[PDB]
Structures are given as C-alpha cells and as structure tokens.
Design a protein around this motif. Sequence first.
Motif, short mmCIF file in Angstrom:
data_model
loop_
_atom_site.label_atom_id
_atom_site.label_comp_id
_atom_site.label_asym_id
_atom_site.label_seq_id
_atom_site.Cartn_x
_atom_site.Cartn_y
_atom_site.Cartn_z
N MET A 44 12.52 -63.06 2.81
CA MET A 44 13.14 -63.18 1.47
C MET A 44 12.36 -62.34 0.46
O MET A 44 11.85 -62.87 -0.53
N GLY A 45 12.23 -61.07 0.70
CA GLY A 45 11.60 -60.13 -0.22
C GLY A 45 12.59 -59.74 -1.32
O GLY A 45 13.80 -59.66 -1.06
N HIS A 46 12.08 -59.47 -2.51
CA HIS A 46 12.90 -59.03 -3.66
C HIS A 46 12.32 -57.76 -4.25
O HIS A 46 11.10 -57.54 -4.24
N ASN A 47 13.20 -56.97 -4.84
CA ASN A 47 12.74 -55.94 -5.80
C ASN A 47 13.62 -56.07 -7.08
O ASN A 47 14.45 -56.99 -7.21
N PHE A 111 19.24 -55.60 -10.79
CA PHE A 111 19.64 -56.30 -9.58
C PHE A 111 18.53 -56.14 -8.55
O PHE A 111 17.63 -55.30 -8.68
N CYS A 112 18.59 -56.95 -7.49
CA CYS A 112 17.76 -56.80 -6.31
C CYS A 112 18.52 -55.98 -5.27
O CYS A 112 19.68 -56.28 -4.96
N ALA A 113 17.91 -54.92 -4.78
CA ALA A 113 18.61 -54.07 -3.83
C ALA A 113 18.87 -54.80 -2.52
O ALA A 113 19.83 -54.45 -1.85
N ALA A 114 17.96 -55.70 -2.10
CA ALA A 114 18.07 -56.47 -0.87
C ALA A 114 19.24 -57.47 -0.98
O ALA A 114 19.98 -57.77 -0.03
N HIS A 115 19.39 -58.03 -2.18
CA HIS A 115 20.32 -59.12 -2.48
C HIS A 115 21.08 -58.79 -3.74
O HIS A 115 20.73 -59.26 -4.83
N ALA A 116 22.13 -58.01 -3.61
CA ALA A 116 22.86 -57.50 -4.78
C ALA A 116 23.55 -58.57 -5.53
O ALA A 116 23.94 -58.34 -6.70
N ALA A 117 23.72 -59.76 -4.97
CA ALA A 117 24.20 -60.90 -5.73
C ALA A 117 23.26 -61.30 -6.85
O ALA A 117 23.69 -61.97 -7.81
N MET A 118 21.96 -60.99 -6.70
CA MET A 118 20.92 -61.25 -7.73
C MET A 118 21.00 -60.16 -8.77
O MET A 118 20.67 -59.01 -8.50
N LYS A 119 21.47 -60.51 -9.98
CA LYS A 119 21.76 -59.47 -10.99
C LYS A 119 21.66 -60.04 -12.40
O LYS A 119 21.73 -61.25 -12.61
#
Length: 125
Positions: A44-47, A111-119
Amino acid sequence: AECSVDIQGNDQMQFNTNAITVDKSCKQFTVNLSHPGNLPKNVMGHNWVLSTAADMQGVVTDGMASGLDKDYLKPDDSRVIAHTKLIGSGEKDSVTFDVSKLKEGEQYMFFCAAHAAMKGTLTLK
Ligand SMILES: [Cu+2]
C-alpha cells in the motif's frame, strides 16, 4: 501566508484531505507527504502527483500502461507538474514546485498514481 502543506496517505487507500490551497503570494510551494499506516510500499505505497484536472485521466492511462516499473507514471510526462516518490508506512517525502507553473485559469488536481481513486483539488487563493 503559508506555502506548504502536510498530507497523509494511509493503509485504507486514502489521503487525509481532498483540497489543498496555495496562497497567491507563494512563488514556491512544498507538499510534505507521509504514510502513518503500517503497510509497506509493496502492499500500500502512495505518492502525490499534480496535473490539471483535464489531464488527470490521460496521465493515469499512460501511467497504467507504463506500469509498476515506473511507479505508474509515464517518464517525463509534461502534464505532470510535480510528483513525490512512492512511500510506505513510516516513510516520508516532500516535493517543492514553482507556483508559476500553474496554467492561468486552469483547475489543478492531485492524486496518487498507484491509486487514482485517491484525489483532490489544488487551488490558488
Ligand atoms: Cu496510493
């Protein structure tokens, strides 16, 4: 004025805000990303990535095609104004960018590139 923000991404695949404000006086702005969860970056890494709202989907499409090897961003994508490294729990990264880079009259998003739902949105005030 304040010209930086602290943002978190956690084990439940979310950032801790959906809105960042950049004061119009700032010439540089810094985002301090942390990960106060327990999951490591290979789970579960984020950027944190900045583009216009209009460019987000294209950035994610091309990032998806570029894959895990590139942290889900097209290398040198000119639509990406700034981005952090991918972090896991307990890690941190900051990115600083020139506020002059924001195209006038355009709405920006992060946004998070790994998890584009995170915005969220990034706006001048
Ligand atoms: Cu993420």
